């Protein structure tokens, strides 16, 4: 039912859809194309965030830490950055920054403090994460290439790793629950899954767009019942295709109405 639902929608909606759910409830899973590779985007700023914040376990004053922000270091989208260029973000704005406003440069600052792209895989694998792979920074992993390995993971694996930075043990307590808040606080995802979901629900989530009319976002959600893991990915052929967040509200009204 769900699965021919999901595939009515993909069809419609012209691209390719990856959806992966977790029910915390009883571990049960509905995956569409779960094991297909799709360019994340800027749901890739959670792991780089949760990286910064595993390295605060150890150095407690690191979310303290002043990030020079240069003229040179602004990229294509830093609605904060863009306000202390000359000047320093803490590494615990920085990470705010990139989360709940999506901030390019933000996320540089991260990767960057992670020792690249690869740090950022580095830590990924740390967790047991085999599949998340970032190799490039803000704005060229979002070119989305049909085909590309580059900047990919799975819905499968996405939201395996979200479950586990979230409500697992990958993160201390604390760290944990500073991922979690900074999530809810999003402010890009009225939109896309949220859109989808009874209102009575809460949730947090990241959303990420880029090329071939990319269009993502990964979510945790407190139901009446335990707490679920949703990520749904949406990429098209066609390198100026439009945003589809509609496409994501869809597939999670979906999957709701499912449970
Ligand atoms: O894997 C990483 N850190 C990590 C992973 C798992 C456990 C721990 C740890 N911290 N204190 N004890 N163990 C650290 C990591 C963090 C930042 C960058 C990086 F490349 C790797
Ligand atoms: O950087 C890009 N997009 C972008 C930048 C900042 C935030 C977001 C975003 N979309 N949904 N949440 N955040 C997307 C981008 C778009 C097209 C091509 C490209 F190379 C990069």
């Known amino acids: ?29 509905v ?37 020079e922000i240069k003229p040179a270091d602004l990229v294509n989208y830093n609605p904060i ?3 202390h260029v000359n000047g320093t973000m803490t590494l615990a704005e920085l990470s705010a920054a990139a989360l709940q406003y999506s ?35 803000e704005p060229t992993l979002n070119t989305a290439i049909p085909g590309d390995p580059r900047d990919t993971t799975t819905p499968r694996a996405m939201a395996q790793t979200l479950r586990q930075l979230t409500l697992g043990h990958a993160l201390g307590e604390t760290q944990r629950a500073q ?3 900074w999530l809810k606080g999003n402010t890009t995802g009225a939109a896309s899954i949220r859109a989808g979901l009874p209102t009575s629900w809460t949730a947090g989530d990241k959303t990420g767009s880029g090329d071939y009319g990319t269009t993502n976002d990964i979510a945790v959600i407190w139901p009446g019942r335990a707490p679920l893991v949703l ?23 979906i999957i709701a109405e499912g449970l």
């Open 231 to 253: 990520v749904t990915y949406f990429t098209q052929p066609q390198q100026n295709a439009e945003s589809r967040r509609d496409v994501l509200a869809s597939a999670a009204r």
């Open 179 to 181: 991922l979690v808040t």
């Open 1 to 29: 039912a769900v699965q021919q639902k999901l595939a009515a929608l993909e069809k419609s909606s012209g691209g390719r859809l990856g959806v992966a759910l977790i029910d915390t409830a009883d571990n049960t899973q």
């Open 31 to 67: 995956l569409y194309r779960g094991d297909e590779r799709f360019p994340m985007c800027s749901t890739s700023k959670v792991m780089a965030a949760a990286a910064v914040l595993k390295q605060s376990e150890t150095q407690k004053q690191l979310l303290n830490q002043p990030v």
């Open 81 to 83: 950055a863009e306000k």
């Open 103 to 137: 901030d390019n440069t933000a996320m540089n600052k991260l990767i960057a403090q992670l020792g690249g792209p690869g740090g950022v895989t580095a830590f990924a694998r740390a967790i047991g994460d085999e599949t998340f792979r970032l190799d490039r920074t």
